[PDB]
Design a protein around this ligand. Sequence first.
Ligand SMILES: NC(=O)C1=CN([C@@H]2O[C@H](COP(=O)(O)OP(=O)(O)OC[C@H]3O[C@@H](n4cnc5c(N)ncnc54)[C@H](OP(=O)(O)O)[C@@H]3O)[C@@H](O)[C@H]2O)C=CC1
Ligand SMILES: NC(=O)C1=CN([C@@H]2O[C@H](COP(=O)(O)OP(=O)(O)OC[C@H]3O[C@@H](n4cnc5c(N)ncnc54)[C@H](OP(=O)(O)O)[C@@H]3O)[C@@H](O)[C@H]2O)C=CC1
Ligand SMILES: NC(=O)C1=CN([C@@H]2O[C@H](COP(=O)(O)OP(=O)(O)OC[C@H]3O[C@@H](n4cnc5c(N)ncnc54)[C@H](OP(=O)(O)O)[C@@H]3O)[C@@H](O)[C@H]2O)C=CC1
Ligand SMILES: NC(=O)C1=CN([C@@H]2O[C@H](COP(=O)(O)OP(=O)(O)OC[C@H]3O[C@@H](n4cnc5c(N)ncnc54)[C@H](OP(=O)(O)O)[C@@H]3O)[C@@H](O)[C@H]2O)C=CC1
Ligand SMILES: [K+]
Ligand SMILES: [K+]
Ligand SMILES: [K+]
Ligand SMILES: [K+]
Lengths: 310, 308, 308, 313
Amino acid sequence: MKVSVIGASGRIGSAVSFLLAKEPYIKDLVLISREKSLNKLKGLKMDIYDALAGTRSDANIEVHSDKDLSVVDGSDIVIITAGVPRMSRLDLAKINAKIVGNYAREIAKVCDTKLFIITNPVDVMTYKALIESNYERNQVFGLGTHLDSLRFKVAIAKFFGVHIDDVRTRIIGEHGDTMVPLLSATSIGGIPINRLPNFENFPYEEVIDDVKNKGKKIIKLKGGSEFGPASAIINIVRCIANDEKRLLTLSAYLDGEIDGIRDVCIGVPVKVGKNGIEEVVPIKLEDDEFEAFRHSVEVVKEYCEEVKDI
Amino acid sequence: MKVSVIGASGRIGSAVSFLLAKEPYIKDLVLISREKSLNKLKGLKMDIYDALAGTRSDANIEVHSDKDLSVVDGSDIVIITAGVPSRLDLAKINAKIVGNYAREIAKVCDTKLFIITNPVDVMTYKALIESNYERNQVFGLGTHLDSLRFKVAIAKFFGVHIDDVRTRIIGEHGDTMVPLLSATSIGGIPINRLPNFENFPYEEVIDDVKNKGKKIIKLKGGSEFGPASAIINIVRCIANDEKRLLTLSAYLDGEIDGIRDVCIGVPVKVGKNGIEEVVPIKLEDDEFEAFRHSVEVVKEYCEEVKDI
Amino acid sequence: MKVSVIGASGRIGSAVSFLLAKEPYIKDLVLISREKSLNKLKGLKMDIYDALAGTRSDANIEVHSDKDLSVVDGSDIVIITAGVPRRLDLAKINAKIVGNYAREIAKVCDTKLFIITNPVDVMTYKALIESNYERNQVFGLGTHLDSLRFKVAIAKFFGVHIDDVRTRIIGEHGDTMVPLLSATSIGGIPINRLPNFENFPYEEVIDDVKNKGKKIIKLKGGSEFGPASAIINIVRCIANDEKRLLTLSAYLDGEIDGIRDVCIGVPVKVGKNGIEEVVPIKLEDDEFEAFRHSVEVVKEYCEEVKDI
Amino acid sequence: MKVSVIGASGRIGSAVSFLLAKEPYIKDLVLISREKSLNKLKGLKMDIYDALAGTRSDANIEVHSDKDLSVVDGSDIVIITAGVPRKEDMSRLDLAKINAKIVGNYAREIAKVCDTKLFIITNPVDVMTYKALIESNYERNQVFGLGTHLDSLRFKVAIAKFFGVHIDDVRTRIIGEHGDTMVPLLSATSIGGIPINRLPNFENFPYEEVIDDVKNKGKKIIKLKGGSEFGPASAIINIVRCIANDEKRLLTLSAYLDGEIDGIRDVCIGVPVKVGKNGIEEVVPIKLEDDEFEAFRHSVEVVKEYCEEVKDI
Ligand SMILES: NC(=O)C1=CN([C@@H]2O[C@H](COP(=O)(O)OP(=O)(O)OC[C@H]3O[C@@H](n4cnc5c(N)ncnc54)[C@H](OP(=O)(O)O)[C@@H]3O)[C@@H](O)[C@H]2O)C=CC1
Ligand SMILES: NC(=O)C1=CN([C@@H]2O[C@H](COP(=O)(O)OP(=O)(O)OC[C@H]3O[C@@H](n4cnc5c(N)ncnc54)[C@H](OP(=O)(O)O)[C@@H]3O)[C@@H](O)[C@H]2O)C=CC1
Ligand SMILES: NC(=O)C1=CN([C@@H]2O[C@H](COP(=O)(O)OP(=O)(O)OC[C@H]3O[C@@H](n4cnc5c(N)ncnc54)[C@H](OP(=O)(O)O)[C@@H]3O)[C@@H](O)[C@H]2O)C=CC1
Ligand SMILES: NC(=O)C1=CN([C@@H]2O[C@H](COP(=O)(O)OP(=O)(O)OC[C@H]3O[C@@H](n4cnc5c(N)ncnc54)[C@H](OP(=O)(O)O)[C@@H]3O)[C@@H](O)[C@H]2O)C=CC1
Ligand SMILES: [K+]
Ligand SMILES: [K+]
Ligand SMILES: [K+]
Ligand SMILES: [K+]
């Protein structure tokens, strides 16, 4: 497999590149940056190679500028982590829709691939990448409410005193304040947490608000999330690599699977495999959660229109 | 961690010895068998060693007989996979086997006993009584194996990676299972809230699970790799103190409806101290009743093999 | 990746199937046996599925007899473990088995043939000829396993992790082995330079490495976990195009001292396309002479089975 | 296992915390920082936790400051990545004097709390490891640094990218100082176990150029990206794994010598060390060639001079 990370010079880009080179199935890895940042990537290449030596891993890392994206040909996934530093949730959306749109257009002129969008707003940037690439919807997806579901997993596991991996929850909709945390998909060991001791003392609304404000807290404290997002990305790349056909949650295009909702890219239950988003699974939603998903689809559609012509 | 396997010459025993030797935490593995089978273990130690050479692993594998169980001293866990393949007959014969091994082990050291011998929910109770060990240290691999088989059948009907399925079965490792369809979820999403669940043949699936052990015994001769890997998950949770909610044959002292004096498959939080608590999950109505029925039948068998 | 295991009902074939399904790249695994063992395979498929559920792995296992080998088409690799277990007579018996299998596999598709049947060098040669496959596509697990056994012996005498040891044995998987002390290392450090090499019983250890197969057969009934894990390493090298310098039974076409028309254990670069290169390392005169003798006997046995 | 990373707010420290949290044997991870960097660690703990949610891992990350180091009590290892940024206007002696006080104060206060292993990453790593062993008054088997091992992995990268081989198939050793007095052991350099002198095309290996590159690779990574993080962090994890699972592996680390090599004593320098549950369990005295052994004597002499220069800091 060959994966090209556009934005490898950044925080998430560099972490994703190192974790990706370690991945056994990743043979070739193309690190793409703006020409000015290319030296930062040279030092990433060296650093990653050193880690590969101390990880019993190997990869052909390959550092290029963004000038000619023909270096991404043969790549099965092009992870776009490139984003301007932040200026509202709409303003950065116009700047980053410019960036992601140009990257998707040029990538599509060069080859056919799966575009993994990490730039924020991730649902709007995934929609912009799909629009400008003219790629089929199975090929363009963004890491969205999955990172939120991982932060939720942490909160639940720490409260219930279990290995973080034993918790498995799902949050759909916008990677933002209009999240739709599915408490019916929240379980420790496959057992719904409502049926577990002390769920009555679980501060769910506090925990969900904290989950919503965790990205901001990490920006304010360290300067931005890097390892959490990067690990979440390696999961998706591994699913695509080994055709694992897994029910995951990704920002993908809806075309009537869930309540006839179309013309948007939002967090949805999807079956990921070698062909990207193979199907948007229409999981049965409670009435209150389905309403919240409709609302997040409304806000995301408004934002998507504000950058459709960018 | 030092783990001793009693019955390593068997199907499950040899598979579990190879897998445990590969585990990084396992530093000392003590294989044990009847003297008449000790040579089969001497070969096993060799073959596993070569496997360790080709898996980047290392382990100090000692091979001994069951005549001096002092070799199990220092064993964090002792996995008893020893036993012969009439139900009350297998419970009585394997109860002599497991009870003797537990008594002798308890005279050597204070370890945790992982009973794999069948009837597992009864051999686990026999091990606990004949050891006098604290309840938290004796546990058995019961409904967990059945839950992995159910996991397979679901993951194939719904066309997902098996590991995206996560289910749970409680009660007896036997025809009185209590499968928790309310605790069956793909991606955390209950199957009841998933497309095509209507056409999921739950009843056929659970019946095939009930007899999958007998069908492997008929086709291959006995479950070897499935049971072994299931053992390694428990050994890992104990070694790394993962404090995970699993399902094991464990002693009940009233955590679930005052049910006591029974070792049965239950939700248990497992860590460095074996069974750390019997978590009383809120069961459904039909489920809790099939669980009291499984506790009833299992208590019958435990009585039938108490004077053994 | 799709791999077919021809001979999966066997001891080695079953361990190889369980480990191959557990691998993340193996998406399809086609287990093939004679009709008389097809049921044994359908319980292996079940048993492995149960392990895959307990190993967070998944795969699509397909069980078929050897009657119609069209079930192997699409395989990147076909691992032939089918073979009468254990001299020249065994070569003839298994040359018929391997020759017919390679003939019918080559009539079904073009694939890589990983040959485990013994005499592995001779059987790899017979597979190459009877399939008319390219020489980069046919290879066997030969002296690599001897090197892993030498690895165990060295690591134990020197008190180091088994994986810290790295040695090379070339030539035949047998009594014409050519152990290369010049390549035996610990941490990359040649063992001669290490402390206490003067006390290492090299000749006794190599004699033991040669007879280790015979001893595992006498004590347990045949090697399975060692050879299976070794096979996994080779399959993984192909599946990830690791381009690792390994030792495998491969066809020589003059890379080493103009030695040709033989499939013998040699240093090769394994990758996506199989034997990408036979690397002619600098062998001492003594080692090279032993390699020439080994090649001689292997060619004698290869001629004795040239029409079988 | 409980590992305390002092200096986790940095590049090496944060990378190492993330990897250690993922390690299955790490149950407690204590991240320590200056009081002005504690927020940078509370963001780190969160980020790593999210990573542990997406890596099927779990750990109890506790975030404290360097004021009270009674928080590291119970640690099997304390990895000190604390160090000053090497500004261009800083000599070797200047950074040695600056980081000798940092490492010495941390060693003294960590010893006042408990008895643990001190994994020194701060450069000059040999001199800092020596200062930490001295000011901790610990057993010499318990204090050890990451030195020529990283230079060895970089040599491995340069070898495996020249010979067209997987990186892990190359195994080489560099002993001596994590610096210009390095002693690369071409005797201990191999591919698949085959010494590389016995390999096709060793004639054209630019070994001397390669070694000068491996000697300046850290400086180049600093110039380009700002400092290595993943290389040293992964190497650190390898050492922690050998200690935790008692693998008894022959590694190369900065360790104290008490005569194992030609009566060379009173120096923490890069040497072959069998690492296990008890840190440096033996300094293995491998048979170095004459030129190699002279170069090692030289590296020891220079490192002893650096140590005398920071003996009273
Ligand atoms: N929803 C999710 O899952 C998450 C999404 N994110 C998003 O991912 C992005 C990456 O953030 P992060 O990497 O942490 O921060 P960085 O700012 O460190 O990454 C910025 C990267 O984007 C590149 N870049 C900046 N401006 C432009 C431009 N005008 N044109 C092209 N490339 C440009 C930078 O190159 P240079 O080196 O020249 O600056 C650098 O490669 C952010 O947009 C962030 O919002 C963040 C966390 C989680
Ligand atoms: N808990 C679970 O989910 C499962 C448990 N099992 C149970 O575990 C046991 C092992 O099954 P399996 O290994 O597959 O079958 P095997 O018969 O292949 O293994 C038998 C093993 O038990 C030992 N053994 C047999 N009889 C005695 C005896 N009288 N005293 C002491 N040791 C003895 C044997 O030693 P020797 O070779 O010397 O006879 C050998 O080690 C069975 O009781 C089986 O029912 C099996 C599968 C599922
Ligand atoms: N070089 C290596 O690394 C090693 C290679 N080996 C070799 O591999 C072979 C298998 O070893 P092992 O599995 O332990 O032996 P087993 O006897 O345990 O299994 C034999 C397997 O070979 C198949 N087989 C036997 N005879 C025939 C035949 N006439 N036609 C087709 N298939 C046949 C069997 O099918 P069925 O089940 O129907 O009988 C079964 O699949 C042996 O030849 C052995 O020498 C073994 C160890 C080390
Ligand atoms: N042994 C090897 O091969 C390698 C060694 N290193 C060495 O390890 C150290 C860390 O490198 P790196 O993390 O990349 O550099 P950074 O500057 O990125 O991080 C420096 C770290 O050291 C801490 N620190 C700085 N000054 C002091 C002080 N006076 N007292 C206590 N803590 C302090 C910082 O905390 P704050 O946030 O307050 O600044 C921060 O945690 C350096 O000394 C470097 O030379 C690095 C790589 C390889
Ligand atoms: K890789
Ligand atoms: K081990
Ligand atoms: K698989
Ligand atoms: K951990």
